[PDB]
Amino acid sequence: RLTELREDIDAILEDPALEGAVSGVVVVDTATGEELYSRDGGEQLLPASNMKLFTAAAALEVLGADHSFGTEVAAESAPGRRGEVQDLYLVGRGDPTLSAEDLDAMAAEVAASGVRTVRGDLYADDTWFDSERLVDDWWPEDEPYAYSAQISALTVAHGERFDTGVTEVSVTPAAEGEPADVDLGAAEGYAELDNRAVTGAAGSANTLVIDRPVGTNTIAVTGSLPADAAPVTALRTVDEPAALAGHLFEEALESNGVTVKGDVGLGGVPADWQDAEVLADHTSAELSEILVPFMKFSNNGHAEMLVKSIGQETAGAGTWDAGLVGVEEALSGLGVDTAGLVLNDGSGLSRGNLVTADTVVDLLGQAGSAPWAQTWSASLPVAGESDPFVGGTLANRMRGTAAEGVVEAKTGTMSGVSALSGYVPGPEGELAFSIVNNGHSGPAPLAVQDAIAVRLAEYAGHQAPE
């Protein structure tokens, strides 16, 4: 059974899809500590999203399962008989789940408090973190896309998945020969529009492209959309998330009967502010629940924001160098051995990240007996579960296998990088595993990953649901 398995796993790692890859593969029976399988466990590799495992663990250690995030609106002094204020401030403190709705509720409060006219200017204040929007080694050509959304303390998250710092672009065909309609969404009147796109003949080739040319706040739409085609939605990022938050707030305010007379822009609450009058606040859900969309779907924005929030908590510094040391620290404090870990971001988007599989599993261990173990394990995707908020990035993997509904694991993926790491809970004992592969040249080796996970479910004592 023990030896049978090792031979099995060896055979699974023979796949011609792992030609020239290096693969870190480690299993450990968590109840005993018995090492069921080690290949290249000490090997350093790019984790892609498995980096989140470390990030998520630190944040629970540093902020607690109970931490929530706040956003305030502040005028220098309360409104009067006339219901007047000068300048106005939207202050963000790193809520990663702050919606356009949450903005509206705040506009209503601002109104119910007696503001009727903002005589001066409206300022977006994201100074709780620094203004370093991107990690050095993140790639410019990735910048238009959601997962490479700019980082701020004030960022409007779109939808139930809480994608920060984007806008939904909806392109809709017209008649053949006419420009397609482009609807920028939230960023209407914020981001510039460059619509060059056209409506091709019925059943012609869909070739429409949506992009934000580097260094601009402009959405460039090119190509041709079929007259019979269903409208295309895309999540494209914008320049300066806080400014967009600022923009949508002037809209929220006017829609709650509050006239902004001036200009929207970035700016922090001035130092010469004696005793700021907070005119509306909002509080996020607790870190325990934010974890779900974060880990289930692999929100890069969330991981980074959580890094800077650790920097704030440990050093009063909403910063990358700060928060990342905070992560190594908290991980050590947990009993993790962080020698082979190189930390460059919280999301794992950076090719500067390195981890080993011994380290990953080491972490799986400590995490499993932390006071916050349940809320941590709840956050992971569950093999083959059809509910997006449960199956997460595993929803359409491993369906109808022994792994289904039992294996809890985080995935990770980019060019030449795939990883799966997590638990196999058994009527035997609860297993922990890490599989991390680099340098494969073909399609991401998901079959291999799945086969191993499925074997470990079977060794754990499970059968495929029929």
Ligand SMILES: *[B]([O])([O])[C][N]C(=O)C1=[C][C]=[C][C]=C1Cl
């Ligand atoms: B995890 O594997 O999702 C981290 N990686 C990414 O999110 C990613 C990296 C490079 C290109 C696209 C994506 Cl989604």
Ligand SMILES: [Mg+2]
């Ligand atoms: Mg607008």
Ligand SMILES: [Mg+2]
């Ligand atoms: Mg099962």
